[PDB]
Subunit: 114 residues, 4 copies
């Protein structure tokens, strides 16, 4: 099934934050309405926050996360969780190798902000 694609409230600010846990340098791309809106990169095996940014979901609300290492797309896993019918987290894990820890780049999207 498609992973890393989320429908957010239209025209709404959201936070996107990426963490690295791999020997490989991670590159995380965030697409809003199918166009790159943010790119983060780094290399850590200790959960470095390689990027954090506030974006707007735009007219369509479509947000997609992609992750690659050495130009090869990582396999993604994702889900969205809503607390007290209001607080939202869109979650992404990714795997760049063979151990299946899926933490090589971890991405958290949160809204609402403010």
């Amino acid at each position: 099934a498609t992973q890393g694609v989320f429908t957010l409230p239209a025209n709404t600010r959201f936070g996107v934050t990426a963490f690295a846990n791999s020997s490989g340098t991670q590159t995380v791309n965030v697409l809003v309405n199918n166009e790159t809106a943010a790119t983060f990169s780094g290399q850590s095996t200790n959960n470095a926050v390689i990027g954090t940014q506030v974006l707007n979901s735009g007219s369509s609300g479509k947000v997609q996360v992609q992750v690659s290492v050495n130009g090869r797309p990582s396999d993604l896993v994702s889900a969205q969780v809503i607390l007290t019918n209001e607080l939202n987290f869109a979650l992404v894990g990714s795997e760049d190798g063979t151990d299946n820890d899926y933490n090589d780049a971890v991405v958290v999207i949160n809204w609402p902000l403010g």
Copy 2:
């Protein structure tokens, strides 16, 4: 129901990261086995990261997040989500006022690392 309390696997490193979305200064305390292990403080209405750290869950695996604003405890909401039976997120929102956006401090705990 109690919120903000999570049982992690014993002796496991985890990341904890806090974001702020409120006019009030947020104080986030992270307890491991009932003792303070990290404290973050900051003010933002733009989802700023007010702290990030890597901790060890210790022998008990018990991790608790508490949030207060100028000494007043915030009401919390939380849940844990596991993707592909491997990647864990323990999520906390908090409310310091009357609007019930529950994002006034947002805390994300993730494991495994590495």
Copy 3:
């Protein structure tokens, strides 16, 4: 924070299913637009499906679950999870005593159907 309240897309069929795990007889009421639309009762310590039903969210999309034991309201916990940006689960646990297993009545709402 408020628990057991979910906003579904309007005029949408959804499933609601209740399970019992307690010495006490559980009464589960499912409200749509603040009016009871389904009720289930029963006792089990072995997860009996005390009821399942297909309901329509109606014009408001507001769905609330309430649980009581011989008229005494149980404490609720809840969250919503979305898989592959399309499959929704609204989840409720409830506690009628002191042990905090929160499984005394468990309610699962799922959509879309068909």
Copy 4:
């Protein structure tokens, strides 16, 4: 990523319940320790419960859900959610066709019981 595989606490009773939402007959196999422990089947486009059972996670705690329709395994999506650090849901959706509603068989695993 692997989906529909969950590690439960060892020797723990859990509920498993399946719903159908498709033109095709769903066969759901529930494996414990890599051996079939339960099989449910049925056809519904109205979320009928096609099976429910209490099982034991056994010494390894490994539980897997597989879904087949028209002689072929369906594509699965899954996640585990934990409420108030106590109540566990392991959730599975499945797609037997081309519409990507992922509800064709929906499987809910819950623990603890009792």
